Amino acid sequence: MVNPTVFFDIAVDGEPLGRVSFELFADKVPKTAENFRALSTGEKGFGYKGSCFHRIIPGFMCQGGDFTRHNGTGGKSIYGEKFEDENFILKHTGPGILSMANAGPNTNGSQFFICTAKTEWLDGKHVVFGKVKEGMNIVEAMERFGSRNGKTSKKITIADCGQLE
Ligand SMILES: CCOC(=O)CNC(=O)N(Cc1ccc(N)cc1)Cc1nnn[nH]1
């Protein structure tokens, strides 16, 4: 009944930075929320632990989730390599929105982004499925290691992750 909560513990060149937690909107996008939850616990035998944020653009977003190729060309879902766009009920309203990255219609895998600005031009094209609950300050600290072209100045990793409650 209650929407699940997951955490990431973030590191910067291997040094601990802080924790970011997320509410997942399982009430509105159950299939998409479940994929992110299971990848965060690692319960299917694969997932986010140890992976990096490969593309960070200040004033736009932080992107990660490519645990197979580490550069934006890989990742896989708990349902197979790809799965469909579930719905577009929720919109990209401002900083803290959690949404699926993709390469065209019906190509969701594991890659995701955290908005650091309103990104309304993505509405109806990327599936919104959660939001930052605690640690937006940690996301803002991460964002400072990005650049205009998205290349990071230090390595930003998910040192640990899992489900709270
Ligand atoms: C704001 C979100 O924008 C997008 O999602 C656009 N595509 C995108 O960023 N991709 C391609 C991509 C994504 C998901 C999957 N599953 C496969 C490929 C990765 C990438 N990383 N660096 N350059 N491109």
Report on this structure:
The structure is a monomer. The chain is an alpha+beta fold and 165 residues long. It has a single domain (1-165), classed as Cyclophilin-like (Cyclophilin). Helix content is 12%, strand content 30%. It is built from two helices and eight strands; from the N terminus they run E-E-H-E-E-E-E-E-H-E. One of its GO terms (molecular function) is integrin binding. This is Peptidyl-prolyl cis-trans isomerase A. There is a cross-link at residues 28, 82 (Glycyl lysine isopeptide (Lys-Gly) (interchain with G-Cter in SUMO2)).
Strand order of the largest sheet: 3-4-6-5-7-2-1-8
CA radius of gyration: 14 Å
Number of domains: 1
**DSSP E strands, number:** 8
Largest sheet composition: 8 strands, antiparallel
Supply the helix-strand structural class. Answer: alpha+beta
Approximate strand percentage: 25-35%
The CATH superfamily turns out to be Cyclophilin-like
**What's the CATH first level?**
Mainly Beta
- Helical content band: 10-25%
Q: State the distance separating the first and last CA atoms.
A: 13 Å
- Bulk shape: globular
PDB class: isomerase
Keywords: Cyclophilins, CypA, inhibitor, PPIase, complex, isomerase
Assembly: monomeric
Entry title: Cyclophilin A complexed with tri-vector ligand 10.
Task: Provide a compact summary of the structure.
This protein is α+β, with helices and mostly antiparallel strands.
Which helices and strands, and how do they pair?
Blueprint: E1 5-12, E2 15-24, H1 30-41, E3 55-57, E4 61-64, E5 97-100, E6 112-115, E7 128-134, H2 136-143, E8 156-164
Antiparallel strand pairs: 1-2, 1-8, 2-7, 3-4, 4-6, 5-6, 5-7
The protein binds the ligand CCOC(=O)CNC(=O)N(Cc1ccc(N)cc1)Cc1nnn[nH]1.
Residues 55, 61, 72, 75, 101-103, 107, 109, 111, 113 line the site of ligand F1Q.
PDB class: isomerase
Keywords: Cyclophilins, CypA, inhibitor, PPIase, complex, isomerase
Assembly: monomeric
